Amino acid sequence: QEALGMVETKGLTAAIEAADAMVDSANVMLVGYEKIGSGLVTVIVRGDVGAVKAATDAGAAAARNVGEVKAVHVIPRPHTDVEKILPK
Amino acid sequence: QEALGMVETKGLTAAIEAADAMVDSANVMLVGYEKIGSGLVTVIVRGDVGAVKAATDAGAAAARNVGEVKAVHVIPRPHTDVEKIL
Amino acid sequence: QEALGMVETKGLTAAIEAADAMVDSANVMLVGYEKIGSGLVTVIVRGDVGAVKAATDAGAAAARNVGEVKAVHVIPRPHTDVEKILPK
Amino acid sequence: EALGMVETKGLTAAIEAADAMVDSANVMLVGYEKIGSGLVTVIVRGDVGAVKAATDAGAAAARNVGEVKAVHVIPRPHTDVEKIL
Amino acid sequence: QEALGMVETKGLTAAIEAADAMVDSANVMLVGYEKIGSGLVTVIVRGDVGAVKAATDAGAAAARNVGEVKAVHVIPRPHTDVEKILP
Amino acid sequence: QEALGMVETKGLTAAIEAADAMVDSANVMLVGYEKIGSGLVTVIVRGDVGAVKAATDAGAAAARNVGEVKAVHVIPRPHTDVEKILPK
DSSP: OEEEEEEEEESHHHHHHHHHHHTTSTTEEEEEEEEEETTEEEEEEEEEHHHHHHHHHHHHHHHHTTSEEEEEEEEEOOSSOSSTTSOO | OOEEEEEEEESHHHHHHHHHHHTTSTTEEEEEEEEOSTTEEEEEEEEOHHHHHHHHHHHHHHHHTTSEEEEEEEESSOOGGGGGTO | OOEEEEEEEESHHHHHHHHHHHHHHSSOEEEEEEEOSTTEEEEEEEEOHHHHHHHHHHHHHHHTTTSEEEEEEEESSOOHHHHTSSOO | OEEEEEEEESHHHHHHHHHHHHHHSSOEEEEEEEOSTTEEEEEEEEOHHHHHHHHHHHHHHHTTTSEEEEEEEESSOOTGGGGTO | OOEEEEEEEESHHHHHHHHHHHTTSTTEEEEEEEEOSTTEEEEEEEEOHHHHHHHHHHHHHHHHTTSEEEEEEEESSOOGGGGGTOO | OEEEEEEEEESHHHHHHHHHHHHHHSSOEEEEEEEOSTTEEEEEEEEEHHHHHHHHHHHHHHHHTTSEEEEEEEEEOOSSOTTTTSOO
């Protein structure tokens, strides 16, 4: 029932906007962001699957008005150990 | 609670110039700059919404004369979670 | 030795998707993510060869719907030498 | 105390810039900075006139070795800007 | 003294494969790998000249099936200063 | 008169070859290598101007047979202070 949601941007400003836009719905928690170099930044949230889909949709839309979005994705997860697949 | 302002440049020189122009007024705090690769540098400031809007306009204006501006943005009230990114 | 599984993608998002399918599809331990530039991310797992083969197949398949998969590979018996190369 | 910068593509052009800069004027080398895309920034300090001459010279010199992407002088940088350098 | 071998790839998976192929023979030692950005990863080995030649050829052959080979090179007798740059 | 010599490559293997060739061909000491990301590596040597000139020429030619050379440069230096313009 609990998903992980991601917006990956090229540019930091757009990722910060994506993060802010996603948590605007109190139904989503920010886990954090990941940098992999080459200007690529990934923002990650968790919450109920439906909330996460809606949050990620809004976050991507917002980021695209600020900079470049490279990927938007939602991963449903198991009830225990939801974040154990995340880096760092 | 406090507004968030960002000027993101390609090039450090342009970013430092943006940083300098932004801190020119007293009610603006420079949080720092962030590097993410591909030459991309983001300067981040905090303050009252009005001060931050004016600072970021100015930072963007100053930087574009030195190098490439990639993003200029203000979030009047960032959510408390976003503070984990700064 | 415990086999090694690797899925390498362009973008972190496809890679997290891969990690999800991998540890979900078989008894593999997530070793970590590795960044090398040009947007390339490698997800690495460990386990017995059969589990790793199944996980790697699953990770690659899942990731191809999310982003570009650049490499998929299994080393059934890595050396200790090579394990000092790995993030563990 | 003025701030000077030469930003090049490639480290070699940058090191050439540092050489021309500290040779042609009374500037102190504060350091090098890398930001990706092959971009390296050389930073100097000194009185503005020295810094202006150094950056002019460093850029001219760096251009003989490689590509200069940015050149800039900040006569009086702010105190907060001093913590990011 | 010992010879130096390098297999440099674009892609990490390819580099790990090259490393595994090279250290398969007992007289070749893995010195380490280096990342320099742009996806370029270098695997470095030491051993007798002959072993290092066969090892690097094999590492490159293995790696090219997984990703891109960027450099394959052997230094029969490295000069000592060169060891001050190795991992 | 003491100079600084540099060969800058895209790729590490070509740089190691440049380094080896430089200290092998002339009475120059290897100062070190610098990575600035994006595959760019700079090898630096020190010695008399003639030696540094002979080394860098030999380093560039050797490296060009192994990979991509981006820059080759000799910097004559003052008597005192010869290495203080170097980074890190």
